[PDB]
Structures are given as structure tokens and as C-alpha cells.
Amino acid sequence: GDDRELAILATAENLLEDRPLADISVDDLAKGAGISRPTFYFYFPSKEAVLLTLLDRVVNQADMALQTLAENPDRENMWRTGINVFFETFGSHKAVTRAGQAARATSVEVAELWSTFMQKWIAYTAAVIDAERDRGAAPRTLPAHELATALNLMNERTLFASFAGEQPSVPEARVLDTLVHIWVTSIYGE
Amino acid sequence: GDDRELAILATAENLLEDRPLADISVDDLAKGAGISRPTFYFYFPSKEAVLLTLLDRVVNQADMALQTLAENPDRENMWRTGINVFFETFGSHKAVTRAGQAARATSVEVAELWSTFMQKWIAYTAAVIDAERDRGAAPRTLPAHELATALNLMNERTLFASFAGEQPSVPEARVLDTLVHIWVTSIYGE
Ligand SMILES: CC(=O)NC[C@H]1CN(c2ccc(N3CCOCC3)c(F)c2)C(=O)O1
Numbered sequence: 564g565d566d567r568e569l570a571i572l573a574t575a576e577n578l579l580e581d582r583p584l585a586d587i588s589v590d591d592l593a594k595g596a597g598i599s600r601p602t603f604y605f606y607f608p609s610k611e612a613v614l615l616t617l618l619d620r621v622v623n624q625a626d627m628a629l630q631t632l633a634e635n636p637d638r639e640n641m642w643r644t645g646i647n648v649f650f651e652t653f654g655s656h657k658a659v660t661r662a663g664q665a666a667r668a669t670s671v672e673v674a675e676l677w678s679t680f681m682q683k684w685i686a687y688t689a690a691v692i693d694a695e696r697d698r699g700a701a702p703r704t705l706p707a708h709e710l711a712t713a714l715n716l717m718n719e720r721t722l723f724a725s726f727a728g729e730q731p732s733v734p735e736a737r738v739l740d741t742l743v744h745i746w747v748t749s750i751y752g753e
Numbered sequence: 754g755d756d757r758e759l760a761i762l763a764t765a766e767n768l769l770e771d772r773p774l775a776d777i778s779v780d781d782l783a784k785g786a787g788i789s790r791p792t793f794y795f796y797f798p799s800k801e802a803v804l805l806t807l808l809d810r811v812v813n814q815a816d817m818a819l820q821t822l823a824e825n826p827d828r829e830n831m832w833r834t835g836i837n838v839f840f841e842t843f844g845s846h847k848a849v850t851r852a853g854q855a856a857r858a859t860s861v862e863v864a865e866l867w868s869t870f871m872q873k874w875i876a877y878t879a880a881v882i883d884a885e886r887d888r889g890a891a892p893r894t895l896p897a898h899e900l901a902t903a904l905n906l907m908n909e910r911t912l913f914a915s916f917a918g919e920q921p922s923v924p925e926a927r928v929l930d931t932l933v934h935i936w937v938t939s940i941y942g943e
Pocket residue numbers: 632633641642644645646647649681684685687688689691715718719722
């Protein structure tokens with residue numbers, strides 16, 4: 564039962580590494596999962612729903628890793644370890660990341676899923692900036708929530724350009740340092 | 754001759770304010786332009802080609818405005834006036850901007866057009882950062898081209914989220930100040 568669904572999900576993630584979702588059929592997904600097409604539709608209403616579940620797993624993986632960091636005890640290193648959660652989680656799931664990004668234009672559930680977790684991560688970013696200002700380590704410059712929004716959107720666009728190998732992009736081996744520098748200077752700079 | 758093409762372009766930009774390109778037909782474009790459908794196809798092979806021409810006009814408008822600034826004579830104000838070129842140009846063409854962004858996923862000519870001008874604007878950003886470092890006004894921190902890439906991708910994503918009213922986004926009345934702060938602190942901060 565659970566294994567057939569997992570088999571579908573594993574096949575989809577494996578097939579997404581070689582071609583986009585538009586070049587993958589339900590028959591492809593069923594074959595790689597060792598099931599029939601009617602059996603597929605018992606577990607998922609569409610191949611788009613399979614992607615939604617894959618993306619949901621990846622964004623929740625990143626969210627739970629951030630929560631783990633948040634519950635635990637320099638300033639540059641604090642932000643680097645946190646940004647790294649997203650660099651490593653989405654970089655370990657590049658095919659799903661890329662396909663989920665492109666799905667936002669056509670899937671309201673995917674758009675709402677991405678929007679929901681971006682709001683959460685921006686609010687937590689803003690809370691950390693506020694706490695940094697409260698203790699006197701960061702200056703009171705921009706409204707923290709607007710600063711947090713821009714920095715998070717930067718990371719979204721820059722990480723996914725690097726993972727997709729877009730032209731232009733920051734080389735993947737340089738993107739962590741690049742983002743950390745911009746976060747640290749814009750949060751602590753006066 | 755030239756007027757019929759211009760009439761097609763004006764109709765498309767006007768129709769794109771109320772609905773996406775997928776909800777606009779060649780018959781819509783021909784009717785608003787006061788021509789027949791075969792006459793439309795004399796001027797453009799598809800409605801996607803009409804969008805390409807519209808976007809080409811907008812990115813060249815922004816590029817030429819930047820060139821005008823570049824040929825002419827504080828540091829925060831220098832970057833603000835330059836970022837404003839893109840805020841005003843694309844903000845005066847929000848429907849085309851939005852439709853052209855979404856077209857990158859399906860149109861190679863649109864993707865290459867956006868990629869071409871982003872490379873140009875990143876290289877010019879990097880050259881200004883370098884000149885700022887050469888004269889001693891900016892510290893030698895990140896490689897200037899990688900810094901320039903991240904900042905330009907930030908502006909792309911943040912401007913277009915604000916113009917589209919996405920959730921999350923920086924309010925349009927705050928996005929110029931937000932971006933200028935992040936550019937200035939990350940270029941001049943040590
Ligand atoms: C005190 C502490 O633990 N600091 C670590 C920071 C990291 N971080 C954060 C949030 C969202 C993101 N992003 C970037 C990538 O995509 C979306 C969200 C991010 F990179 C980093 C945050 O608030 O905690």
C-alpha cells in the first residue's frame with residue numbers, strides 16, 4: 564500500500580532528472596513503479612499531483628531542518644548555517660525543485676504551497692533580524708519584514724538559477740558565499 | 754503598413770492587462786487592430802511572436818535608458834537612479850513584463866532575450882563595482898561579477914513579485930528603497 568505510492572514517487576523523481584513533467588506520462592510512472600495505470604489513479608489523480616507531493620516533501624524537509632536549527636544554540640556563521648539548510652535540501656532534490664518552480668505558473672496548489680512556506684520563512688527571518696536589533700547587534704534600518712522578503716526572494720531566484728545551470732547564474736560552488744555576504748552586509752550594515 | 758503592426762502591438766498590450774496570453778486569440782488581436790486574421794499572419798507568425806516583440810521593446814527601452822545614464826555625470830544616489838530605470842520602465846509595462854516572465858518557460862526566444870540583457874546588465878553592474886573598488890570607494894570582498902549576478906537576480910525576482918502583487922512581495926511603494934539598501938550595503942560593506 565504505502566510502498567506502491569512511494570514507488571510512484573521514487574519513479575517520478577528519477578524520471579524528472581532526465582526530462583520535464585510534460586515529457587513524462589502516467590504510463591511511464593506506472594511502469595517504473597511496477598503497477599498498472601488504473602492502479603496509479605488509485606493513489607494519485609494525475610502526474611501533477613505526484614509532483615505536488617514530491618515538492619511538499621522537499622519543502623517540509625527544509626522547514627523541519629530549519630526548525631531543528633532554531634531549537635538549538637558568530638553572526639556570519641549563524642546565517643551561513645541557516646542559508647545552507649536550503650542550499651543542501653533543494654540541491655539534493657534539484658529535479659523536483661526545478662519542476663516545482665515551473666509548476667507554479669500552472670498549478671494553484673503548487674503556487675499556494677510555495678507561497679505558504681515562503682511566508683513562514685520570511686516571517687522567521689524577520690523575527691531573527693528583529694531579535695538582532697533588540698539586542699543591539701543590528702542597526703534599525705529597513706523594516707525587517709521588507710528586508711527579509713527581498714533577501715528570501717533573492718535566495719529563491721539565485722539558488723534555483725544556480726541549480727538549473729541558467730545563464731546567467733552564480734556557480735553552484737560560489738552561491739553559498741555570495742548569498743551569505745549579501746545577507747550579513749544588509750542586515751548588519753549601516 | 755507600420756501602423757497595422759503597431760496597432761497589433763497596442764491591442765496585445767491592452768489585452769494583456771486583463772488576461773493572460775493563453776486567454777487571448779489571434780482573432781482578438783486582429784479585431785482590436787481592425788484587420789482580418791490572414792492580415793495578422795502577414796505581420797506576425799503567432800501571438801507568441803507579438804509578445805516577443807513587445808518584450809523586446811521594453812527591455813531595449815530599459816537598456817537605452819541605462820546607457821543614457823551611463824554617458825552622463827553621492828554613491829547611494831548613483832545606484833538608486835540606476836535601479837529606478839528598471840523600476841520605472843518595467844513598472845510602466847507591468848502586463849508585458851509579467852507575460853514575458855511567464856513565457857520564458859515555454860519560449861526559447863524569450864528565454865534567450867531575457868538571458869542576453871541580463872548578461873549585459875550584470876556585466877555593466879560588475880564594471881561599476883570594479884571601478885568603485887579601483888578608486889578605493891568599495892572594498893575588495895566578493896568577486897564583483899558574482900556579487901553583480903546575485904543582486905541583479907534579486908531585482909528581477911523582487912520587482913516582478915511586487916508588480917504582480919504576489920504573496921509574498923515587497924509593497925511596490927517600498928521596493929525601490931529596499932533594493933537600494935541591499936545593493937549599497939553589499940557593495941560598500943566590509
Ligand atoms: C538564528 C538562525 O537560526 N539563523 C539562520 C537563519 C536562516 N534563515 C533563513 C530563512 C529562509 C531562507 N530562505 C532562502 C532560500 O529559499 C527560501 C528561504 C534562508 F536562506 C535562511 C533564518 O531565519 O534563520
